[PDB]
A paper describes a structure:
The X-ray crystal structure for protein 18-19 was originally solved by Lo Surdo et al. and found to adopt a novel zinc-nucleated α/β-fold not yet observed by nature. A zinc metal ion is bound by tetrahedral coordination to four invariant cysteine residues at positions 23, 26, 46, and 49.
Protein 18-19 was the highest affinity clone isolated from round 18. The structure of protein 18-19 was solved from the anomalous X-ray scattering of a zinc ion bound to the protein using multiwavelength anomalous dispersion (MAD) methods. The Cα backbone trace of proteins 18-19 and DX can be superimposed with a root mean square deviation (r.m.s.d.) of 0.51 Å from residues 7 to 71.
Numbering used by the authors:
A (entry chain A), B (entry chain A): 9 to 71
Write the structure that this text describes.
Amino acid sequence: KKTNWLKRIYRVRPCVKCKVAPRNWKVKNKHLRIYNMCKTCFNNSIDIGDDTYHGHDDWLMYA
Amino acid sequence: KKTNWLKRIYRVRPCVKCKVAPRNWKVKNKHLRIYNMCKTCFNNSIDIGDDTYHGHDDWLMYA
Ligand SMILES: Nc1ncnc2c1ncn2[C@@H]1O[C@H](COP(=O)(O)OP(=O)(O)O)[C@@H](O)[C@H]1O
Ligand SMILES: Nc1ncnc2c1ncn2[C@@H]1O[C@H](COP(=O)(O)OP(=O)(O)O)[C@@H](O)[C@H]1O
Ligand SMILES: [Cl-]
Ligand SMILES: [Zn+2]
Ligand SMILES: [Zn+2]
């Protein structure tokens, strides 16, 4: 059930910048990192000079 | 925001056995463990001989 909760929280938090697309993520190690923004908004953030929305949280994948 | 998510998931999952009371939990280390059952149902499970509902998940408290 932890895995279904991770999935549920991933599906209810859209990108903070565009409010439509899902967030980017990576499986680092044995942690899942959910970044604040989709990939397209993150790259845009780099081009326009804004980093106010950079960030992420980590969730581990056991139990 | 991770902390508000942990709180949200704790508030939406009641005890698996009695379906009313919130689950028991402990802060082990720097992990939060949410057990499957309230304390009163867990102790009952020990007295009646059923362990079908024993278990828990772990959530870390960073990011
Ligand atoms: N898609 C994204 N949305 C928001 N923040 C991001 C995104 N991608 C990268 N970042 C930011 O980049 C920084 C770290 O990059 P990352 O590759 O996660 O870690 P590492 O330092 O291991 O490469 C963090 O502050 C992270 O929030
Ligand atoms: N309230 C509860 N609800 C469900 N399972 C429980 C509960 N309390 C203890 N358990 C079970 O007891 C076992 C481990 O006990 P616990 O104290 O969490 O770990 P430790 O082995 O570090 O003492 C686990 O299988 C756990 O699910
Ligand atoms: Cl977690
Ligand atoms: Zn976006
Ligand atoms: Zn109960």
